[PDB]
Structure 1
Amino acid sequence: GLRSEHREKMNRMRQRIAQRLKEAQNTCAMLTTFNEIDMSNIQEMRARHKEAFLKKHNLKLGFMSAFVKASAFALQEQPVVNAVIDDTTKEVVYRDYIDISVAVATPRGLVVPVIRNVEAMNFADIERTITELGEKARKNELAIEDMDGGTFTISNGGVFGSLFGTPIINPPQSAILGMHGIFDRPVAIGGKVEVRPMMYVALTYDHRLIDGREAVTFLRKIKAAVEDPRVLLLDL
């Protein structure tokens, strides 16, 4: 059309992503599985214990530290999705620990800082860490070591209202979860219909490392540990 196309040069760190992205693909064997989560039982947990959580911890109670804790429940029972594949040597690298890498969206784009050692953390020391890092994201002081590492990753593309979608691994990892909106959608509970707030939830995964058994089941733990968070105490 109108020859009015203005261009701008790629500075390195903006194109450098594109390079270290296309070694996620062309390295991994990315696939994607989905399920849906009825978030009703955990919204009431944020309707009842919100103030008590505030007047005690002075922290904001979110529906996100569940997906971080449930993703440690499951990620400790299926250590593959905690693991990775080394490329230099062809050898898996299992891990006893988990240092989840959470994504927080920002004006300048997106950062992914880490919550290290979630296995030795409760469901409120997480929210202590997120708020410690959301603040650290707004002012651009977020260091490298805080973003360095990771064994698993969670992306909340639901604050913006996506229904579902295909996340991308931000390596070195072997999977990434993805939360996709809370929309009151009709549901069948007991052969009868009803409306429930519900989230589609996505798990990209490297199929070199992860059979679909190891990933459907992983994502059903995350699905049960969030419809009934009481599971997390049972160590089920």
Structure 2
Amino acid sequence: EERRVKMNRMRLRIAERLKQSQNTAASLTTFNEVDMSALIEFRNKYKDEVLKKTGVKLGFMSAFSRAVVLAIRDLPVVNASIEGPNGGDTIVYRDYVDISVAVATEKGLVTPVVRNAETMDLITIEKTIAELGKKARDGKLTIEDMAGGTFTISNGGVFGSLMGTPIINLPQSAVLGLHAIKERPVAVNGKVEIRPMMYLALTYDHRLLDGREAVQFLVKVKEYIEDPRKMLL
């Protein structure tokens, strides 16, 4: 009633490195709620505008990546990394951010990192996201397009997710989670009405994060997302 099937090398390697990314890093997850209607109206209007102007598809991931970049800029412990060989550690603090995004494919999940994104706006972020997407659909992504990376944003929103616990991408130190924005009742300005809010997640490395830095990280990302005017500062 059961068939004998072996595996491939990449499956064994991802299993081994995923197990290694859990017994060598204390993982803790935090959630929050973010209203997202302003992002929706912004995105549709200036998505048609920017499609007319430059020809890129405005989306939420650019805004989330920019908010992540700003919140790392105002708190540098998220981009840290314990690179010491189990001893004599050499915790890193890096100005450059190399956010890794996830794109679906036939092999499964593909995570090609964008290069230094600390100094670049939403438009070029979306442009490089589209570039990575087209390089993923027709496979030209070589090894170096996946190597490295300091942060990671994983989109589980295309599916029907609501919440969940992501994993770290060792030697990384944090991972954000996007969870398929939905219409839910809200207690805004003293009244209850339907708004399209969204959940979030953040898998710590508690030997680096203390819940304090990660919680202010996530709440600052949330408040940036709630109104991009704050991100404008």
TM-score (norm 2): 0.97
The residue that corresponds to 1:48 in the other structure is 45
- For 2:199 and 2:69, the matched residues in 1 are separated by 19
Measured after TM superposition, the shift of residue 47 of structure 1 is: 2.4
User: What is the one-letter code of the residue matched to 1:178?
Assistant: G
- For 2:187 and 2:97, the matched residues in 1 are separated by 36
Measured after TM superposition, the shift of residue 185 of structure 1 is: 0.5
The residue that corresponds to 2:35 in the other structure is 38
Say which of 61, 64, 74 aligns to 2:61: 64
- For 1:63 and 1:12, the matched residues in 2 are separated by 34
Per-residue CA deviations over 1:97-147 (Å, capped at 9, x if unaligned) read 111111111222110011111111111000100110111111121111111
The residue that corresponds to 2:190 in the other structure is 191
- For 1:203 and 1:60, the matched residues in 2 are separated by 27
Q: Is 1:19 matched with 2:19? A: no
Q: CA RMSD in A?
A: 1.0
The alignment partner of 1:58 has SS state of: coil
Q: Aligned residue pairs: how many?
A: 231
User: What is the one-letter code of the residue matched to 1:42?
Assistant: L
Sequence identity percentage: 66
Runs of 4+ in 1 over 4 A off after TM superposition: none
Indicate if the aligned counterparts of 2:135 and 2:141 stay in contact, CA closer than 8 A: yes
Measured after TM superposition, the shift of residue 77 of structure 1 is: 1.3
Measured after TM superposition, the shift of residue 91 of structure 1 is: 2.1
More strand by share: 1
The residue that corresponds to 1:127 in the other structure is 126
- For 1:93 and 1:47, the matched residues in 2 are separated by 39
Q: Is 1:28 matched with 2:25? A: yes
Q: Is 1:106 matched with 2:80? A: no
Say which of 75, 91, 94 aligns to 1:78: 75
Measured after TM superposition, the shift of residue 55 of structure 1 is: 1.1
- For 1:143 and 1:70, the matched residues in 2 are separated by 28
Q: Is 1:232 matched with 2:231? A: yes
Q: How does 1:94-173 map to 2 (within 5 A)?
A: 94-173=93-172
Indicate if the aligned counterparts of 2:84 and 2:91 stay in contact, CA closer than 8 A: no
- For 1:37 and 1:52, the matched residues in 2 are separated by 25
TM-score (norm 1): 0.95
User: What is the one-letter code of the residue matched to 2:42?
Assistant: M
Indicate if the aligned counterparts of 2:97 and 2:115 stay in contact, CA closer than 8 A: yes
The alignment partner of 2:171 has SS state of: coil
User: What is the one-letter code of the residue matched to 1:124?
Assistant: I
- For 2:29 and 2:72, the matched residues in 1 are separated by 17
The residue that corresponds to 1:8 in the other structure is 5
The alignment partner of 1:22 has SS state of: helix
